[PDB]
Chain A
Amino acid sequence: GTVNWSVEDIVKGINSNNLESQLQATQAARKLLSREKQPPIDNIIRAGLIPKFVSFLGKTDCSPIQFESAWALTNIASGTSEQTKAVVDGGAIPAFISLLASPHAHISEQAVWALGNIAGDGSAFRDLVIKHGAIDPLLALLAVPDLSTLACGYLRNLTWTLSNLCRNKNPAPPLDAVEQILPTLVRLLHHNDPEVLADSCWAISYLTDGPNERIEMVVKKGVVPQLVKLLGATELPIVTPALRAIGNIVTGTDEQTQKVIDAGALAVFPSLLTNPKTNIQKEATWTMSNITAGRQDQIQQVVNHGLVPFLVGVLSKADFKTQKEAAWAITNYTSGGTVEQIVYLVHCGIIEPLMNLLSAKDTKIIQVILDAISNIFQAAEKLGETEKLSIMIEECGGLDKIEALQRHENESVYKASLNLIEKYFS
């Protein structure tokens, strides 16, 4: 019937003066654009069909052609930026926003999806969707006493589209749009559907990826406990955005960071720092490095939760990028920590794996490790045990590594190594 039409036949049907012929041709276009292999998006664009599809969005008396054209345009807009731009350039944004209020749920849903693809292109189209007024009608679809009364797929698409309105930087979404969206988003973050939770978490991760004022807007809504609960979820697609969001929040102020600690986040990090997914381990170690850059009482809570042995483990064995985050966590710890916290780090076995990382062909980590070594030596100096540390570094083969760093191709690396071997190993 409408399966596997040629673009030429689609054009012929859409150019008829016959709404039903246009309907079958639009469905045939939709099916072409919905096939799994290589949808002919560019051929459909070059055929000049986008303006007609956009006009079909307005045919209230033929809801089927509204649906079919919304779907066709959704999938054109799923393509490259040039292809999305063709849909926008055809006037699709206001037509899709008007379909959000359609009495037909499948049509409103298709318009939700289309606007998500447009917004997902990047900041400009995101902001253009916002300027055309998409937020009010989108949130009105979710203004129900219980989200569970909405169709699962409808709710997931609404959540994914809202997430794209939260996504991307340079610029971040308009502050007023974020504030308008957040109460609904927090409600989605408590919904029981794993895909809704994942995309809600992603939205929160995007909103917290920025200056402390953006972080504060989110934290003020009280989402941190729910993020920490989701941080302990079994579904990796939920842990990943929940961890990203928690990680973003701890890049903010000590108060914002303390909110994460008080919600119980640190109790989940034994699992996160040993998580078999490398990206989780990395992001968790990155989050830890930003926590160990906090207050001494925050470092202390890291100690109290038993996480220093987990940092020693990551430093001892992990993907190199995770190990680099762990090196940063140690340098931050030793720069801000008390002497008692720093010695505790040594008793946990940090020296050997830290020295072993000096044999890496990466200059940044080398400088980070040398800074940590210096901080630990300064702590030992304050205790008079400087020599004992020197021995330990020598026994593990570290002295040789620092001596070799003298002959490195970086000034700070050479100068740092020379200063250590002169101040402590002479």
Chain B
Amino acid sequence: LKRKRDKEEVQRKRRKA
């Protein structure tokens, strides 16, 4: 029964400040 699934506020892409 197994159940599967630098500017801040950023994970996918990062803007360089």
Q: Interface residues, chain A, CB within 8 Å of chain B? A: 33-34, 36, 39, 71, 74-75, 77-79, 84, 110, 113, 116-117, 120-121, 160, 164, 167, 209, 247-248, 250-252, 286, 289-290, 293, 328, 331-332, 335-336
Per the bound structure, the CA–CA distance linking A332 and B3 in Å amounts to 10
Contact of B5 (CB < 8 Å), options: A251, A289, A331, A332:
A251
Those of B1-17 within 8 Å (CB) of chain A = 1-5, 7, 12-17
7 contacts between A and B (CB under 8 A): A33-B15, A120-B13, A248-B5, A251-B4, A251-B5, A328-B3, A336-B1
Out of A33, A160, A248, A289, name the residue touching B14 (CB < 8 Å). Answer: A160
Interface centre among B2, B3, B7 (most CB of A within 10 A): B2
Task: Specify which chain A residues have a CB less than 8 angstroms from the CB of B16 in the assembled complex.
Answer: 34, 71, 74-75, 78, 110, 113
Q: CA A230 – CA B15 in complex, angstroms? A: 28
Closest 10 CB pairs of A and B: A78-B15, A293-B1, A78-B13, A117-B13, A120-B12, A251-B4, A120-B13, A75-B15, A332-B1, A251-B2
Structural contact, B13 and A290, CB atoms closer than 8 A: no
In the bound complex, residues from chain B placing their C-beta under 8 Å from that of A113 are 14, 16
CA gap between A332 and B15 in the complex, in Å: 44
Return the contact of A209 from the options B2, B5, B13 (Cβ within 8 A): B5
How far is B16's CA from A328's CA once the two chains are assembled, in angstroms? 43
Q: Which residues in B have their C-beta under 8 angstroms from that of A84?
A: 13
Which residues of chain B are near A248, meaning CB under 8 Å? 5
Q: Are A290 and B3 in contact (CB under 8 A)?
A: yes
Give the complex CA separation of A251 and B4 in angstroms. Answer: 6
Option from A33, A121, A332 in Cβ contact (under 8 Å) with B13 = A121
Chain A residues contacting B3 (CB-CB under 8 Å) are: 251, 286, 289-290, 293, 328
CB distance from A37 to the nearest CB of B (A): 11
Q: What is the CB-to-nearest-CB distance from A97 to chain B, in angstroms, rounded to a whole number? A: 18
Interface of B: prevailing SS: loop
Given A71-B16, A248-B5, A286-B3, 5 new contacts (CB under 8 A): A74-B16, A78-B14, A78-B15, A293-B1, A332-B1
Least Cβ distance of B2 to chain A in Å? 5
Measured CB to CB, the nearest residue on chain A to B8 is: A36
Smallest distance from the beta carbon of A250 to chain B beta carbons, Å? 8
Q: Which of B2, B7, B15 contacts A293 (CB under 8 A)?
A: B2
Return chain B residues, CB-CB under 8 Å to A120: 12-14
Pair B13/A79 contact, Cβ less than 8 Å: yes
Residues from chain A with Cβ under 8 Å of B1 in the complex: 293, 331-332, 335-336
Contacts of B12 in A (CB 8 A): 120-121, 164, 167
Q: Smallest CB-CB separation from A80: which chain B residue?
A: B13
List chain B residues, Cβ under 8 A from A121.
Answer: 12-13
| Residue on A nearest B1 in the bound complex, by CB | A293
State how many angstroms separate the Cβ of B1 from the closest Cβ of chain A: 4
User: B5 to chain A: which residues have CB within 8 Å?
Assistant: 209, 247-248, 251
Docked CA distance A84–B13 (Å)? 10
Q: Tell me the bound Cα distance from A194 to B15 in angstroms.
A: 20
Closest Cβ of chain B to A204, distance in Å, is 14
B2 touches A290 (CB 8 A): yes
Residues of B close to A293: CB separation below 8 A: 1-3
> How far, in angstroms, from A209 to B14 measured CA to CA in the complex?
23
Q: How far is the CB of B7 from chain A (nearest CB, A)?
A: 7
* Residue on A nearest B12 in the bound complex, by CB: A120
B14 adjacent to A117 (CB under 8 Å): yes
- Greatest chain A CB density within 10 A among B1, B3, B16 is at B16
| Distance of B10 from chain A, by nearest CB (Å) | 8
Interface centre among B7, B14, B17 (most CB of A within 10 A): B14
Docked CA distance A289–B10 (Å): 30
Chain A residues in 8 Å Cβ range of B17: 34, 36
Cα distance A34–B6 in the bound complex, in angstroms: 10
